[PDB]
């Protein structure tokens, strides 16, 4: 439920940690960025596309910790929406 509950005692270092908010402006992810930001062997991996990733790392910008922008959006892309629209055939589109 949090860092301090039992994660503060059961945590071993080479690890993968899914937490906080993808905005990087609150949550446990903020503390983790402040923790592992200094090193270069670590890395942050982004998945949520609704936040501009270059804006998310901006307040922690002079950091050596590798950042990966690999969004995993699964919404309808434009070719799928084109096929969908041509199948359904609505009189109008808004």
């Amino acid at each position: 439920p949090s860092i301090h509950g039992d994660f503060s005692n059961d945590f071993r270092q080479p690890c993968v940690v899914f937490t906080g908010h993808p905005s990087l402006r609150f949550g446990d992810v903020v503390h983790f960025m402040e923790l592992w930001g200094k090193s270069s062997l670590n890395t942050v991996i982004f998945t949520e596309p609704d936040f501009s990733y270059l804006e998310a790392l901006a307040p922690y910008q002079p950091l050596a910790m590798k950042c990966i922008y690999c969004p995993i959006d699964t919404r309808l892309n434009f070719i799928q929406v084109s096929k969908l629209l041509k199948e359904v055939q609505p009189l109008h589109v808004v």
């Binding site: 949090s2 860092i3 301090h4 509950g5 503060s8 945590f11 270092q13 923790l35």
Partner: protein, 330 residues
Amino acid sequence: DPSQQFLQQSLERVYSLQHLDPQGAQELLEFTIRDLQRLGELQSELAGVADFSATYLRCQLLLIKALQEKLWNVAAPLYLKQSDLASAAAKQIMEETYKMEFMYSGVENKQVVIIHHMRLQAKALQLIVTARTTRGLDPLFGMCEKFLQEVDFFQRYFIADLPHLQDSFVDKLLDLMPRLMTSKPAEVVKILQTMLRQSAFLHLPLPEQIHKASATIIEPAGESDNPLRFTSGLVVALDVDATLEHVQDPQNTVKVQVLYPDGQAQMIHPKPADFRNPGPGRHRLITQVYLSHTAWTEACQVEVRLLLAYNEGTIPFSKPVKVYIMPKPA
């Protein structure tokens, strides 16, 4: 109640004998301060007003002690800081006026104008001594104009209270405020110091009901060892509970401060939801607080302490409780 009568008679005793020799005046001051502290210890009802009046009397005692020091007889080049008591006196009275204004409840405008007047006297003493220690003219002009602006801000704030400050220090400053800006700063220092020496001692009208705010940390409790074990860098929780008595707006004024064993003083503003009010006049501050650091050679203790913040600028409020911490490397 003879306790109230004793309090009032002690206060009029020190007020009526303001004409004494500074040695005798100091003796009366500290006698009354000891009496008022003991009175606060005896009866819990009058502990607030005893502490209030005792703090004001301590301010006057420190001012009197500073003004009669052997620092005005010698000239400016022969000034020494090692034997200086007046700078320490000025800082102490400044802090005490803050404490008097904000910690105690039930303060009306007359108490506030008395406290602000004593604060102004403190600022004047600090200006005098800092003029004594320096020779460049830029610092004198700077803090002298800031102090005269402070006097103007005072007398503007308290126009209604001015006809009651009779023979007061501010009454003597108002006789010369339009003309003091004309004179050279050394003469301004001379005149304000001299007329500060013979300034009257202001009566402090007591409120009908008044208490000193108090906080009692109970949940950390500083019991013993078996420190808080947590991994380095990560966070260790610390549940904090305190009983706060006679505070008006704790959720906008009470700040939790922690002191790691270094310069860091991480200050926390708890949310207004954790300030409960189970009974009238007493609160409950049931707050979780978070601490963190890197690995330490062995366990050490962090001093967590309540603070009280006023409109910025803050004061200590409670007894600092230490809690041991054991950051183990991961």
